[PDB]
């Protein structure tokens, strides 16, 4: 029994967006979704934050898959990852939006750049840790590599978001088309680690 919130960077450097919705489809279709099973909410951030749907909006896997396919890329000049994570913690994981007392809490964060608000990450991550939110973080290195930008500081930032052990919770994904390849391992760990 898990409440899972997926936190999606919507910035326009991620391309094609079909790669992200394919990742969502493949990950979510392997779950048993319902008010007494797994619940999924999805938040998208860029420059601001939007709840695509709350944890208790949908009570079946079929419904979640239909909604996930329709999620549009929202774009954004800036990448406010700390705001996205903090909003997932303070808003998505609330009883008002369907969060359940006593279930396992998992956040999955998908991003392709360093965050403009990275000075907030230390506090935001510690607040998630205090609230028992297990964090899987996914760095997509595609746009950085395509722009010949160094990725080492980026990888370090996204690793810092992942729960320990870091190597089980952090995924380095070379490019958008490779995102779907992590689904089997990610799903296994979501339901195996605490
Ligand atoms: Ca970006
Ligand atoms: Cl209510």
Residue numbers in the entry: 32 to 225
Q: What do the study's own words say?
A:
Integrins are widely expressed cell surface receptors that couple cell- extracellular matrix (ECM) interactions with the cytoskeleton and transduce mechanochemical signals across the plasma membrane initiating a biological response. Four I domain-containing integrins (α1β1, α2β1, α10β1, and α11β1) function as collagen receptors on numerous cell types. The bond consists of a glutamate or aspartate in the ligand and a metal ion bound by a metal ion dependent adhesion site (MIDAS) within the I domain. In contrast, while Ca2+ promotes α1I ligand binding, it inhibits α2I binding, suggesting these ions differentially regulate the interaction of integrins with their cognate ligands.
The α1I asymmetric unit comprises two molecules whose structures were analyzed for discrepancies relevant to Ca2+ binding. The RMSD between the A and B α1I molecules is 0.13 Å. More specifically, the α1I domain Ca2+ coordinates D253, S152 and S154. D150 and T220 interactions with Ca2+ are water-mediated (ω1). In total, the Ca2+ is heptacoordinated with three residues and four water molecules. The metal-I domain side chain bond distances are approximately 2.4 Å. Exclusive alignment of Ca2+ vs. Mg2+-bound α1I MIDAS residues produced a RMSD of 0.24 Å. We found that Ca2+ functionally substitutes for Mg2+ in the α1I structure. Specifically, Ca2+ is properly positioned in α1I to facilitate binding by coordination with an acidic ligand side chain, initiating the allosteric mechanism that leads to signal transduction. Specifically, increased flexibility in α1I domain loops βB-βC and α3-α4 would allow for the expansion of the MIDAS pocket necessary to bind the larger Ca2+ ion.
